[PDB]
Amino acid sequence: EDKQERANYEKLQQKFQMLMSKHQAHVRPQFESLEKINKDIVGWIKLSGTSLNYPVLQGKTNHDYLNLDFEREHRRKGSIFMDFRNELKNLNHNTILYGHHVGDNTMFDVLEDYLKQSFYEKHKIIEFDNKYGKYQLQVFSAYKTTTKDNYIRTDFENDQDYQQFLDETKRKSVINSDVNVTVKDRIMTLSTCEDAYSETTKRIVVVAKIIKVS
Ligand SMILES: *[C@@H](C(=O)O)[C@H](O)C(=O)N[C@@H](CC(C)C)C(=O)NCCCCNC(N)=[NH2+]
């Protein structure tokens, strides 16, 4: 169970790695393949040298995969899942991703590490891939938060309105980044999540500039 869970992710991690090697350049086939397992698997997130290396889910709601893994089995750690509002094909300004932080170096435990500049330095880039392209996540802000909204905004009203969001995001960061974001760029937010009804004013958020490298 608690070790079978690592078995599954191990299997899958190794599976994904070979797919990303067989087809290489092409990404369309790697996910058409993962979709056989579960049609709700819409992407992959990986950070080399860490345990952050999982498939990303998406359901009709934001609690669909809270306590479910990629093969739809109940698990306290659920899955890493995209906001039910976000778009796979054509990204929104801000694509949100959520995942647990139970403290055993799995799922989104690694987000906490980004609160240290040192760690940020050694890990400025996170890989994100899906059925439509390869992307590179350029981390530029990491912080702890008590609020439950605002940083959960998919699309925006206008450049002025969006400009503010980027500015606050930057102001809230507890680490210095040499990246440069603008109302032009699209961003991705990584946030931790507690079980449903599991009150906790402590959340960790990581925001990055989304670069399509394909
Ligand atoms: C954990 C998190 O990181 O926020 C989890 O996704 C969550 O608490 N989400 C919010 C909802 C949106 C950010 C508005 C929440 O109210 N928690 C319960 C699940 C949300 C209910 N379902 C939907 N579709 N809003």
Report which protein residue has its CA nearest ligand 1's atom 22. Answer: 62
**89 and 67 in contact (C-beta within 8 Å)?**
no
Can you give the CATH number for the domain in which 125 is found? 2.40.260.10
For residues 117 and 128, what is the distance between their CA atoms, to the nearest angstrom? 22
Atom from ligand 1 closest to the CA of residue 149: 13
Cα-based torsion angle of the residue sequence 192, 198, 202, 204 in order, rounded to the nearest 10 degrees: 0
With CA atoms as reference, report the closest residue to 60 among 83, 94, 87: 83
Domain residues for 80? 1-214
- Token pair of 156, please? 């925006």
CB-count burial class (<10 Å; 0-12, 13-18, 19+) for 189: buried
Which DSSP letter does residue 50 get?
S
Backbone angles phi, psi at 154, to 5 degrees: -65, -75
**Which contiguous run of DSSP H or E holds residue 191?**
strand 187-193
Work out how many domains the chain is built from and give that number. Answer: 1
* Resolution stated for this PDB structure, in Å: 2.7
**57 and 67 in contact (C-beta within 8 Å)?**
no
Backbone angles phi, psi at 199, to 5 degrees: -45, 135
Report which protein residue has its CA nearest ligand 1's atom 19. Answer: 63
> What's the Cα-to-Cα distance from 187 to each of 24, 92, 134, 162, rounded to whole Å?
25, 8, 15, 11
Strand, helix or coil for residue 5: helix
Which DSSP letter does residue 139 get?
E
For residues 138 and 151, what is the distance between their CA atoms, to the nearest angstrom? 17
Could you tell which of 68, 148, 193 is best to mutate to test the pocket of ligand 1, judged by most ligand atoms within 8 Å of the CB?
148
Atom from ligand 1 closest to the CA of residue 98: 3
Which DSSP letter does residue 62 get?
T
Query: For the CA atoms of the chain, what is the radius of gyration?
Result: 16
| Single-letter amino acid code for the residue at 9 | Y
For residues 4 and 20, what is the distance between their CA atoms, to the nearest angstrom? 24
- Token pair of 1, please? 């169970």
